[PDB]
Amino acid sequence: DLDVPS
Amino acid sequence: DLDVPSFL
Amino acid sequence: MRSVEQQLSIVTEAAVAPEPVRIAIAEALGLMCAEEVQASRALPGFAQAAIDGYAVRAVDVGGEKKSLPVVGEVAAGSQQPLRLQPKQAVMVHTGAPLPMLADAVLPMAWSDRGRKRVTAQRPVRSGEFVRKEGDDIQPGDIAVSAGAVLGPAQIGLLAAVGRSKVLVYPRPRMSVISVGAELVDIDRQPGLGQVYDVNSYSLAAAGREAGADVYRYGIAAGEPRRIKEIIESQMLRSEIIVITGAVGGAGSAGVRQVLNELGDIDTERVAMHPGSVQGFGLLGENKIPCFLLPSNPVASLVIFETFVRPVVRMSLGKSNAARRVVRARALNHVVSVAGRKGFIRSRLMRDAETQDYLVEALLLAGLSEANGMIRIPEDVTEIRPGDVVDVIFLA
Amino acid sequence: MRSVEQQLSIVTEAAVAPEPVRIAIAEALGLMCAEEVQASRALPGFAQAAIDGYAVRAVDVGGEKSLSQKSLPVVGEVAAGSQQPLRLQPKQAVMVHTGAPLPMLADAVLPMAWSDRGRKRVTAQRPVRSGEFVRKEGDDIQPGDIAVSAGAVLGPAQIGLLAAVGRSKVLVYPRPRMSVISVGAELVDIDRQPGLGQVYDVNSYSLAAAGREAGADVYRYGIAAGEPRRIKEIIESQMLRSEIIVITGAVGGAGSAGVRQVLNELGDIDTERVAMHPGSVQGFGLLGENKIPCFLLPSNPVASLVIFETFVRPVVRMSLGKSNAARRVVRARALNHVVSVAGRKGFIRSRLMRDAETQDYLVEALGHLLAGLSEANGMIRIPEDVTEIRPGDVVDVIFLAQG
Ligand code: NA
Ligand code: NA
């Protein structure tokens, strides 16, 4: 749901 | 989830 | 010392709603309409052909159940009225005014054209392919309502009824000021004892992201009388003022002295870390919110995100834009002071295998690789790797 | 006629990425950094006292004791922002305030609370070791450290970070430049009073706004009027400064043949229809030696917003090179009847809502200018073969997020 790094 | 108006 | 909740309450209650202003409709995109806009004329103002073809009486081509002479041609933008006689055709272009006493446009694709006469391959009925006068908007119709957010379609409607300006609720105006005898602007080469003014740039940007109309004043230098002049100039055109360097290090006593002559200044600390050292006041006859922030740039960003941004959202009168808060696994240890809410700039990520959120707590890295903040509750004093914590996501 | 998908491929494949630019760091907000930025100065640029106390040589105040087991003259006082150089001699102290520049040849600050606090002569009451209570030059950033990487979005903290290392300009991926033009002999500007045959130019305002909402850097040219030679001049001038051009009134009949002929002299123009409703009548072309995407839209304001949403907005997002911002598509129960054309994908501007009790998604179709441009937050996407939607049907809704 959220654009974040890995 | 989404942010929409409510309706009855 | 006040809690974060008490200070948040005080500044929010003090928000100033900007007065409505009349501005060019192009510049109103995203702003809330402060008036009801009614149509006064019919749209379209005349019956117009919707397609290329031949204006006709429907009855002449079988429409109320032989060729017709083509006696004229009308292009879009024609300004001279035309009159059709029975059993005649006039070639019309999309958008042209329909000839008087015609009632239908026979499509070009449905016609067999000689060099003088036209033959309908099928009938059209009365009104077919005619945009009738008032079909799009009628006098008295609400084009735009008070309270509507003005998007591209509403701006189109404002243009359709001939409005060049519209009354809107503007964004709140914020002035960002840096004080400190040691500050130089970023175009200079600082010598011994001198520091680049970081805060005016980063905080002007935070205010823009927050939705404010920002003037970055920059460095305010001089004796306190001159600083009073600068600050007074900003009060005339501001709903919010942000001043860094007014609390904390010495030398800023004179500034707090003039601010006390412009309003009532409060410098009680907030039970939070970083950013416990701050101030807040209301300036002038109109009680403009004035935030006193510290010179430390990380602390200033945290105080601005926690207290200034809510006031911008409140003055704006649109949505709250409240930050999402996700639960994430802590990757490293973080300590926090008992009794202070912690706000640790951090890197929120998605686990490579599980869909889980992980958070890595972070000055160079805090101002660089960070997209979130761990919010440490007053009672919590320790975070060990593996703990699950609240992370304010900085969109 | 081609499908929506074929048309979407054509326009997106032609998207032009804007040339990177070096700009004032305040103006880089929200833009993607096009370079690696390394610090050039150390931060702090000079060693500073971390607390109030006395700058000393640790060895003069117990710093050289083997850890496994008389007063000093105070020869100055330094506050933050002081600009005059000092040099410690052996067995001397300089009283320092938090942030003050350390005198040369000192290596520690004796805390005020660990001293007798004497004004002219100070006595240490606890030992300090070399380096203690000093913010060393470069403690936060050293020259050569990466401040910002290429590909990073420049937010407030990075703009602050750029200012801290003395960068006033940075190379960014700028927003794609879009020029919006209206042609049509019937058009007057909205400050005019239209007569018979005349219409306000609606499209230049609404489409310039849609382009701003999409992330473009928009110049609303407004009405382009004149003989086709003059109109060619106008389009050529907009090609000089644009990655995307949008022209309404260029397609849809014989009245626009003169403008279309000018466009064919500036580039390759395709006016095949797309199997969609509304908006089947549109065109696309590539202008100049750099083949600038040029969207030919119709005079119809509703069809134009739908075409812009479907084909122009994707190219803006690709031109931008940031996120795709592809619209979310939810499944909703239809509230009212809708008809659709066999063989065309339908795009019906609609009201998406949440049921107050079920929490289900409900959609009300709104389809006349007022109803078409009224407040819609979605579009029902009707497949080519569907001709009818009854209340209760579950349909695809393109969510048109505000802004
Ligand atoms: Na805490
Ligand atoms: Na269909």
Residue numbers in the entry:
A (entry chain D): 434 to 439
B (entry chain C): 434 to 441
C (entry chain A): 1 to 65, 78 to 374, 384 to 416
D (entry chain B): 1 to 69, 78 to 375, 383 to 418
Copy the relevant paper text.
In this work we have identified Glp, a gephyrin-like repurposed molybdotransferase MoeA enzyme, and its membrane receptor, GlpR, as components of the corynebacterial divisome. Our studies show that Glp and GlpR form a tight complex that is part of the early divisome, where Glp and GlpR directly bind FtsZ and Wag31, respectively, placing the Glp–GlpR complex at the centre of the divisome–elongasome transition.
We crystallized Glp alone and in complex with the 10-residue peptide FtsZCTD. The FtsZCTD is well defined in the electron density and interacts primarily with a protruding β-hairpin in Glp domain IV. To validate the Glp–FtsZ interaction observed in the crystal, we produced a deletion mutant of the entire FtsZ-binding loop between Met361 and Leu370 (GlpΔloop). The purified mutant protein was correctly folded but was unable to interact with FtsZ in vitro. Complementation of the Cglu_Δglp strain with mNeon-GlpΔloop failed to restore the septal localization or the wild-type morphology, stressing the physiological relevance of the crystallographic Glp–FtsZ complex.
